[PDB]
Amino acid sequence: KVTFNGLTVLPPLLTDEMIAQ
Amino acid sequence: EILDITPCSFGGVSVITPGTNTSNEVAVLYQDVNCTEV
């Protein structure tokens, strides 16, 4: 249901397949 | 022909550190790059 130039994007520490736990 | 352009792969540099109070052997983290590029 939900949808370059030095702008990094750090991944979240927790992954969903953990959150779903 | 049409060539795709991608800006040079790069990222931040992070340092693992147990702490001087324990040791000084450390480990590096390179951000969001395939390792085959160092």
Side-chain angles (χ1 to χ4, degrees), chain B residues 17-31:
Chain B
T17 298
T20 60
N21 195 51
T22 284
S23 158
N24 50 1
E25 183 187 346
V26 300
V28 180
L29 156 69
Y30 293 126
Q31 269 167 5

Side-chain angles (χ1 to χ4, degrees), chain A residues 5-8 10, chain B residues 7 10-12 31:
Chain A
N5 296 313
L7 72 165
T8 71
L10 319 183
Chain B
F10 81 100
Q31 269 167 5

Side-chain angles (χ1 to χ4, degrees), chain A residues 1-3 5-21:
Chain A
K1 269 285 164 205
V2 177
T3 73
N5 296 313
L7 72 165
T8 71
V9 171
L10 319 183
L13 165 59
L14 299 202
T15 60
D16 299 321
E17 77 187 2
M18 294 183 286
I19 300 304
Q21 270 170 56

